[PDB]
Nucleic acid binder design. Structure first.
Ligand SMILES: [Mn+2]
Length: 206
DNA sequence: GACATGTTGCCT
DNA sequence: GGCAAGCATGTC
């Protein structure tokens, strides 16, 4: 096989917007306790800018017991429970209270384990339903709160390997964020034409 | 203590 | 497309 490295501090240490864009095409890897490796290529992200960003948990520089990952070194995971039953996986970027939400993956390896984790553990699921959402991907990759405040550059259960297929400048759609002035600002980024994206913005494309 | 707020699967 | 169940969390 190929000599496989992992993306380190050099990659994670950049402003939220650049990082959110740079994530596109990269491959998120999860190794389960049973030895099974799961792989998914990132196709959709969101940038949360910090104290000025009225949609971010760090708005006005607010630091709570929950959002501490956002104020820790670039690469630190911020995993929180939303709607009492779902997880959102964020990665701290460079900049006070700034992070990036992972929204969607193209599933590449371990799809049958993903389908079990998505259906057998809670509530035939098509391949498109596996990772097409921030909380869907957390379920499919077995991400929960025990992953909160871990370092994505150093952790032996979850890492980021560099992807062979990365989009260039014109292939990236900058659109409004999902479920959030700061509601309308284009801080969501996804691969144009990808069937694995959670929500298509047909207005921000045309 | 109260209570407002924050994605997915089904349904309209 | 619309619609809330879900309960963790933050705030008063
Ligand atoms: Mn509700």
């Amino acid at each position: 096989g190929p000599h496989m490295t992992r993306l380190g501090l050099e990659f994670f240490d950049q402003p939220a917007v650049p990082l959110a864009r740079a994530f596109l095409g990269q491959v998120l890897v999860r190794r389960l306790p049973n030895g099974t490796e799961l792989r998914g290529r990132i196709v959709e992200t969101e940038a949360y800018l910090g104290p000025e960003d009225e949609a971010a948990h760090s708005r006005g520089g607010r630091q709570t017991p929950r959002n501490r990952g956002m104020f820790m070194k670039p690469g630190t995971l911020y995993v929180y429970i939303i709607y009492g039953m779902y997880f959102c996986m964020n990665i701290s970027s460079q900049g006070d209270g700034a992070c990036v939400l992972l929204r969607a993956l193209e599933p590449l390896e371990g799809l049958e384990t993903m389908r079990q984790l998505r259906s057998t553990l809670r509530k035939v699921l098509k391949d498109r339903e596996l990772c097409s959402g921030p909380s869907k991907l957390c379920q499919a990759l077995a991400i929960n709160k025990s992953f909160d405040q871990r370092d994505l550059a150093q952790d032996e259960a979850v890492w980021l390997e560099r992807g062979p297929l990365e989009p260039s400048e014109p292939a990236v759609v900058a659109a409004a964020r999902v479920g959030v002035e700061w509601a309308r600002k284009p801080l969501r980024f996804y691969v144009r034409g990808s069937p694995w994206v959670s929500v298509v913005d047909r207005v921000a494309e045309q």
